[PDB]
Every structure is written in structure tokens, then in C-alpha cells.
Design a binder for this molecule. Structure first.
Ligand SMILES: [Fe+2]
Ligand SMILES: [Fe+2]
Lengths: 270, 304, 302, 270
């Protein structure tokens, strides 16, 4: 079912101010992933973002067309994020229905003005996804869901795609190292805040490249905590869950800073 | 001219309260609901109306910033605020005015006091649902200029103590900004008490038969803390605030409460309770410290 | 010597609120509970504390009488009041004084206006828990004398309509007694609103996580009815009182509310709500009609 | 183990003012029934009174010894009702436990000053029961309990008693037709309110004498509605359930008025 897998950063800095070389490098890398996404001719893009938060039942984007202008509540000074995003209502609605069958209460979200998060918007803009050609099925980051449940959520959404005869591209949107800077910095001297976070970033990235799924599994929770990894690395869990728990390897298209945090573009070889 | 902190309100932001009120600005329609809490706000509403303030300052847990403490810095802001968790209850068209001058004074005092502060200068910025809800609830007229302050990460990213001291400094700084500009300001701590909640949504949200405390322990903490404020034991509430947070999952962790009280110099003064109620099991009290009545409101003369 | 109804309170009698308080008179001891409703009464309490009335008149659903309308008629009454249904929350040692003279005057005016009335002259009579609970809730000092009024069968044995009719007569008969005696009187209607309830007791009764409205519809009835009272639409609440009774199983069927408003000449006046809350699913509002502030309190000459 | 069964009135009028010939006869009939109960040599008296009200769960009196002075809230002018009622704590408690085992939530009520009803008190006084020789197991009249449940409630109490090898006397305490006068009468002029209440009272009593359990069983609901029978005649169901729906006949030792209401003293022939 899955024909593409990607982990793109959820930070808007790469899109917003790409003249900053570190951020520009990440922008091009995400753009490249978008080409690779397109190349695989998926009918839908299975999206999970770390910034798209839910605290009750699980949320699935079910609005046919969401359009507007988002301003990031942290990074408003760097520009605006205009968005025009299609959802596969048929698939997304089927995910809402399948979720309780898999022990997770879920609802659709179809409201004009609904706050689609930064990560989904930036991934959409940079990747050329969210179009009527590459519509989205966005699953929410439920704060009460663990890595294990996130995987169940992706697997689930992959089965619904199969039921519907649809090729799928999975994108997990979120960061790595979570040590954001607490003061205003000069954008061009932004770097990973710790050498410890950087080691951890390069360590797990290497494990993702090799396809070392087994060693990845036992690294993720220690890494998630020690390197303050964006939402417990569940956006990777999303990928794993979609791929049924195995992948041949990965191509690290980009890696860099986002105000002290770590961001990376990973192209999975299935 | 003199600066004045007229009063601090504990003004929670549960969107269901505005849903139940059925204001024309709110798209979804309700059968009513959360009447107890809505009556508490009515009492708060006319208590504020009588204050005739220059400006309302609000600190919202739903504007989370990493790089210090941000301040609304654009004269006019508007848009449709949709609650991300309850979009079926809160789809609110708003239009507000920012007291840019006061916000900047707050930011400067913040900077002068060792905090990293930030002016929100982007006019397309959507003011958070938390701020919008608290404002409508206590002032549905939208006729008082406002100063929206962000809730800095510190209590969650570092810890409660380091985070709370920053809210303390921010409070002191806010006070100093009020007195230098000479504002007649009202402080709004947009915090919920115990934040344990139902993980399941009810078929019809207005169904008050499905609305009650999520936990006994949580509810008891709320009451222990409320009566404590009502006795005026401000010293004792803040002495308990860390454990209250740890065990009640209190939204006072976000910092609005420590900010407000720091700005009020922690007045050992009896608070007026307008009501307590639960929204999704979540504990919410609408409370007031009336500084003007207590002779603690005037701050000194303003600047030239 | 103009008699006045200073105020009429809607003062429900759920024992749990005395239980939650832990007064010295009530034997069982609680971890608190029902704080919203207890604050509601905290307002009503100080509001009554400012009034300085000669007497409090209570109409209680829990003194049921078949033969007419009974009035407490012995100067002093006391005893241990154990709630039959909630004995583990309410075991209250009480001692009260009866304004026997107003009680008698009430029964006479009642008698003259076509009601059958009786004076309760037995000194070993145990005043009902409904009366005791309301009185403690609104006046825990026990320093105002009282005229305890029974709730006559009428609305149950005959029907809502005819029952409220006798209750209406009792009210104006009461107003008439107050103005003839010259008393400065506060009226207490010991009524719950919607009285649908849970059929099970929570393991620990104070557990407020297990406290909420029994039904949606009943709660909705409660709110609507309290709001019309707040909007001064008194004629409208009474136009709706029969339907409210049937659909919400409202305890105003007992008669106190009508008795009170009939004594207040159904003032088209805004009631102050002190608070609403539920006890065992039951709807309870604590409210006041301040007749003295409205200049409707003075009852006329002689 | 059920050695005798009786229905007595709940009204205190016969005890309080027996100088009223009509009320006086009822008092003697109740006193005679007590003589018949004693001769049956029971170990306990299974008592249900129509005036003992429960609204939540079923209540069983579990206080070893309850004493005090009860004043009826309707009939206070006629005198005081002193009482000293002994309960069989073991049996009552066993009835508490067994009740949920039969789908009826129940509790024991063991409180000093608990308001024991007029029916229980007057039955004890007139019959000579609630003594240590004739202790009581009182089961509340739960207003939400039907005839159905009331029998189920008596049957489990008899079974609990059987279980503790105790000879039971069952007493159903309550009135008949309940058309109480709504103005003060001369007590000496008391009579059944109207002839239709009398016809029903007499008809059903005749049915009780005959032991015609079946004809009675269908007469009861219509009798209750039409004659305004005390608490839907559930004090009778209590007898019926205890005897397990079977009895030979009965001897009505008394029948007369109590302020227009009907009252009877019945001795059941098992
Ligand atoms: Fe919140
Ligand atoms: Fe009641």
C-alpha cells in the first residue's frame, strides 16, 4: 500500500526565511522530498504532525478544502503561512470509523477556520502536497497516545487505503532535538544547541539510514527523553506504523538547526 | 496622573461557557449549558463594568512561546477563532484593540528585569482561543483595549519553580509598566484550576447531566485552594501551588496566576468567589481580588 | 404596626449541605461536599442576617398532613432529627422557638378563608427534618423564632391545580395574619426544583465526582424556571408551574413556593439567585425576593 | 418456618383513642391478633409497614434496640406513641446481604433516633411485638418497589430466616381504602368515607377469607386505584410473598374506619 515514506521538519523557519543557509538547506531538502513524493504517484498522503494537537478523541482532517493564512505563534516575525489543502474525505472519514474498531475513539474535523498546524502547512507548501492530486489524510497527535498507539493509528489508516484501492505516501512532520533557544539569536548563527543533542541526532539518523528497525526501537525512548525530541518522536512511530514495522533503509536528504532544535528530512527506502 | 491595578480576576477560558451563552459572534448554537459558571461570569462582568478600566491585561496558556514572553503589539487584531479541541462549540468572530503602548512598556520593563520579551508585530496573527474566550466571558462588548501576554514555556520546559519565578518577574514588570504609563488596568489570569478531564466527548455537549468533576481529589484541591484565597491566605496558596499543580494537574502551571499576583504584590487579601463549576471535569473558579476597595490599587505617579 | 414580608427565600432542604458544613448540632462528620450550594446559602445567610426579622415562616414538604394545614403551636420544640432516607448524613440536635401567636393568627386567617387549619399543640412533636435543615441552612444561630407550616396533601390526593389553589389561599391568609399581628416576617419556601434522583448512594456521599444532574431535561427545566424568576416574570413561572411539576418531578408540587408567592402577592419582581447545584441528581436553587428593597414589603394598616 | 401471618392497621387511632367504639374494636382485634401471633411461638416477626418510607435502596432495621416517643404528624392531638422495639440484628443483616442477590440494593439502618414509623410502633404496642421474645425484621416500603418486588423481598427474608432456622411470624402493617376525611370530624362519628370504599374493602376481605389467592391477585391493582388503598396494598403483597403466594384462608378479626380510611385486622390461615 505505502509507496513513499518521509519525515519532514514541522518548523516554519525553513519555509519562512530560506535566505538563512541552514534553514534554506532544509527548505530545499523538503522540496526534494516533495519531488520524491510526487515521483511515487500516491493517491493520498498519510500525514501526522507533532504540532496538530488533540487531547480528547483522535482527530482526522475531514474538511474537503481548507484554505487561509496561518501565522505561527512563535515565529510570526518571519512571515505568513498561506495554505490551500485538500483532504481525501472518503479515506479520512473511513479512518474515523475504523479507529474505534481498533480501540481508539475518533472524530472528523470539518470546520471553516479550523487551525491546521504549522507543520502540516509547511510540509504542504514545501512538498507540493495537500493538492487535489496529492490530497491529505491528517491524523492528530493525541497527547494521550503513546508511540505504540500512533503506530496502530497509521497501520489502521493504511488498511483503509487498501480497502479503498489507494496508493499511499506517509509523511511524519516534526522535529528531532527539542532544545529550543530561550533568547533571540541572529538567524545565521543558529546551530544545534547541544553537542549531546547533535550526537543523539546523528546517532538515530544513522540507524534510520541503515534500516536498523530493531535497534531503532530500543533507541527511540532513551533518545526521546535525553534529546528532548519533539513529542516523543511519535512522528517516526507514525512512519513505522504505516510501513507495518519494517523498512529497507533511509536517505537523509537534510539535517540542521531550528532555533537550537534539530530538524531533519528523511526519505525512507521501503 | 497615577497608575492603578484596579483588580485581578481569575478568569478561566472554557469555550463551552460562550457556547452556552449563544452570542451572535459564535457560529455553533447551543441549548444553553454551564449556567452556574456563566452566572459567576455575569457577577464578574458587572463588577468589571463598574471598574471602568483603561485596559485589560490577559495571560493565556494557549499562546505558548519558547523565546521569552510575547506581547500583542498591533493596534487592531481580528479573525475567526476556532477552538482546536472543541470546534463544535467555539467558532468565534472577534475584533479587538491592543493597548500597544502599555504592551511595549510591559515588554521593556520585562527586558529591564532580566526577561527576554518580544513584541508581536504581525497584523495577520490570530489571537488565541484562550484569550478570546476569557475576554468575551468577562467583557462581551469588546470596548476595552487589551494587552495579550503569551505564556512562556519555562514551567513546562525547565520546571515549575524556575518557570514560576519568571512569571513573578513578569508580574513585577507588568506592575511597573502600569504605573509608568499611568493605566487604570485590570488583570485577567486566564487559568483553570484542576485540569483532569473526560477523555470522551458527550453526544450533546450542553447535556449538564454528563458534566461533573473528573476526580474527587482534583475537586477537593480546587476547594482547598479557593477557600484559601477566600480567607485571603495568599501566602499559603502559593506555598501550596507546586503540590496543587503536581496532583490536580492545575492549569495555574501556565503562569497567569503567579503573574497576576506578582503584579498585585501578592496581596494577603480576601478574594471574592463568583462561582465554581466544572467543564469536562475540569475545575474552574471565577474569582476577584478587589484592590481598589482594599486601598491597594494606586501605584504612584506616572512618568512625564 | 404595619406587618411586613421583608423577603421570601427559595430555601431547599437537602441534608447534605448541613452534612458538608459539619456544624456542632449534626452528629455525622464529612470531608466537606456541596460547596457551591453551601456558598449559595452563605449569601442567603448574610442576606437574612441583615434583615432583623421577628419570625421565619417555613412551609415544609416533609410535614405532610391529610386533614388541612397544620401550624407548629407550642412555644419550644427540640429533639434529634434523623433523616429517614439519609440517616448517615443528617442526625441533627435542634431546639427552636415558635412564634405561637403568628402561628395561631395564620391558622385563623386560613380558617376564615375556607381552608381547614389546625394548631399542633403536642410538645413532644418532632419537627420534621425538612424544616430543621432549611432553618439551619439559612439561620444556624437558631435565634429567630419560627412558624412551621405543614404541607397539606391537596396536590397529591386531589390534583396539582386544586392543591396549588389551597396553597394560594394559605399564602394570602398568611399575608393577612402577618399584617394583623404586625410581624416583620421572612418567608422560607423549603422546595427543591427538579426532583429526579439517583437510585444509589455513593460509597462516600461527599464524593462530588459522583454528584451531577439526574436528567438533562430536568436540569434544563430548572435553569429555565430560575431564569424567569431572575427576569421578574413571576406570572410566567406560575403559568408554567404545572408542566414543570409533571415533567421535572419538581418538589414545588408540595406547595411552599406557591404559598410564598401568594403571600408576596405574586410580585413581578426580579429574584436574586445565590446559586444552583444538585444533590443526588436533584435540582436546588437558593434564591430571594427582596420585598423591602422593592418597596412591596409593607402589608398595610389593620 | 412461617408459623403465622397477619395484616394489621398502620393508623395509630385505635391505640391512641380506643374510647371511640369503632377505634376501640380495631384495637381489640389487633390485640387478639397479637395473642394469635404469640401462640404461634415465632422466633422473629417479619414486618413491613406502609408508612416506613424508602426512596433509594431497600432499608432493613438493624438497630438492636430502638426506643423513644413517636408523635404522629397527623394524629399528634390523640396522644404519644412510646416504643421500645427490639430487632433481630442477625436476620435483618442477612436480609440486607441477600437483597442485592435478588436485584434489590439494600442497607441496614442502625441509628439512635431513627424515625421508626407509626405503623411499626402501633403494631408493636397493640400486638406485643418488637420485644426481645418477639424481635423484628422490618423491611422498608421503598416507594419505587412494586407488588412484584415487595413479594420477592418478603420471600428472601423468609428464606434468610429459614436459613437461620427461625420460626417466622409475618406482619403486614397498613390500611385498606385510604379516603381520609379532609376536615376535622367528631371521632365518634367516624365511618368509612363512602360506600364504594366499603364495598371494595368488604369484597377483597371476603376474597382474603376464602384463600382465593388468584382472584385476589387480579382484584388488588383495581382495588388499590379505585379505593385509594394504602400504598397500593403492598403490605398484602408482603404477606403473599412471605407465604410464597399460597395460603388456605383467613379470619378477619376486625374491620372499621380510621378517619374515613378503612382498616382491618386479618389472621391468615397458612
Ligand atoms: Fe485550557
Ligand atoms: Fe425533599
Amino acid at each position: 500500500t505505502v509507496v513513499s515514506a518521509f519525515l519532514v521538519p514541522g518548523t516554519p523557519l525553513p519555509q519562512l526565511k530560506p535566505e538563512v543557509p541552514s534553514w534554506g538547506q532544509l527548505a530545499a531538502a523538503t522540496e526534494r522530498a516533495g519531488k520524491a513524493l510526487a515521483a511515487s504517484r500516491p493517491d493520498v498522503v498519510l500525514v501526522y504532525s507533532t504540532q496538530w494537537l488533540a487531547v480528547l478523541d483522535q482527530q482526522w482532517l475531514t474538511r474537503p478544502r481548507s484554505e487561509g493564512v496561518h501565522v505561527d505563534e512563535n515565529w510570526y516575525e518571519f512571515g505568513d503561512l498561506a495554505y490551500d489543502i485538500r483532504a481525501d474525505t472518503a479515506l479520512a472519514e473511513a479512518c474515523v470509523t475504523s479507529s474505534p474498531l481498533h480501540g481508539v475513539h475518533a472524530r472528523g474535523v470539518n470546520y471553516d477556520g479550523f487551525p491546521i498546524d504549522t507543520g502540516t502547512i509547511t510540509a504542504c507548501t514545501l512538498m507540493g502536497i495537500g493538492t487535489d492530486a496529492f490530497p491529505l489524510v491528517v491524523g492528530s497527535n493525541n497527547l494521550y497516545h503513546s508511540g505504540e498507539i500512533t503506530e496502530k493509528l497509521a497501520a489502521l489508516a493504511v488498511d483503509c487505503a487498501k480497502d479503498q484501492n489507494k496508493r499511499v505516501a506517509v509523511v511524519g512532520v516534526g522535529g528531532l532535538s527539542g532544545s529550543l533557544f530561550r533568547e533571540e539569536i541572529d538567524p545565521r548563527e543558529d546551530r544545534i544547541a547541544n553537542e549531546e543533542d547533535d550526537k543523539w541526532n546523528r546517532r538515530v539518523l544513522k540507524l534510520i539510514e541503515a534500516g536498523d528497525v530493531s535497534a531503532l526501537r530500543e533507541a527511540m525512548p532513551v533518545y526521546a527523553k535525553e534529546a528532548r525530541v519533539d513529542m516523543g518522536f511519535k512522528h517516526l512511530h507514525w512512519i513505522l506504523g504505516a510501513l507495518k514495522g519494517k523498512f529497507s533503509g533511509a536517505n537523509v536528504l537534510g539535517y540542521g538547526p531550528s532555533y537550537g532544535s534539530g530538524a531533519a528530512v528523511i526519505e525512507f527506502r521501503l | 496622573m497615577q497608575g492603578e491595578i484596579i483588580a485581578g480576576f481569575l478568569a478561566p477560558h472554557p469555550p463551552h461557557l460562550v457556547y452556552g451563552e449563544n452570542p451572535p459572534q459564535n457560529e455553533p448554537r447551543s441549548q444553553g449549558g454551564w449556567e452556574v459558571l456563566r452566572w459567576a461570569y455575569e457577577r464578574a462582568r458587572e463588577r468589571l463594568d463598574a471598574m471602568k478600566p483603561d485596559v485589560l491585561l490577559v495571560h493565556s496558556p494557549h499562546w505558548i512561546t519558547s523565546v521569552g514572553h510575547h506581547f500583542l503589539g498591533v493596534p487592531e487584531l481580528s479573525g475567526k477563532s476556532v477552538d482546536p479541541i472543541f470546534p463544535n462549540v467555539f467558532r468565534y468572530d472577534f475584533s479587538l484593540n491592543v493597548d500597544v503602548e502599555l504592551a511595549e512598556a510591559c515588554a521593556e520593563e520585562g527586558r529591564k528585569a532580566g526577561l527576554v520579551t518580544k513584541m508581536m508585530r504581525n497584523p495577520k496573527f490570530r489571537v488565541d482561543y484562550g484569550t478570546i474566550t476569557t475576554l468575551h466571558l468577562i467583557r462581551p462588548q469588546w470596548d476595552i483595549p487589551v494587552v495579550g501576554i503569551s505564556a512562556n514555556n519555562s514551567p513546562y520546559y525547565l520546571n515549575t519553580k524556575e518557570g514560576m519565578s519568571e512569571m513573578d518577574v513578569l508580574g513585577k514588570a507588568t506592575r511597573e509598566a502600569i504605573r509608568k504609563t499611568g493605566r487604570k488596568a485590570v488583570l485577567l489570569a486566564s487559568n483553570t484550576l484542576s485540569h483532569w478531564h473526560f477523555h470522551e466527548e458527550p453526544t450533546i455537549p450542553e447535556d449538564m447531566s454528563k458534566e461533573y468533576p473528573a476526580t474527587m481529589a482534583g475537586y477537593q484541591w480546587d476547594i482547598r485552594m479557593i477557600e484559601l484565597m477566600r480567607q485571603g491566605k495568599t501566602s499559603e496558596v502559593f506555598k501550596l501551588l507546586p503540590q496543587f499543580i503536581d496532583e490536580a494537574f492545575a492549569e495555574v502551571k501556565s503562569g497567569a496566576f503567579t503573574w497576576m499576583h506578582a503584579a498585585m504584590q501578592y496581596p494577603e487579601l480576601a478574594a471574592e468567589l463568583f462561582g465554581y463549576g466544572t467543564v469536562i471535569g475540569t475545575g474552574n473558579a471565577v474569582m476577584e481580588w478587589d484592590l481598589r476597595k482594599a486601598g491597594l490599587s494606586m501605584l504612584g505617579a506616572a512618568d512625564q
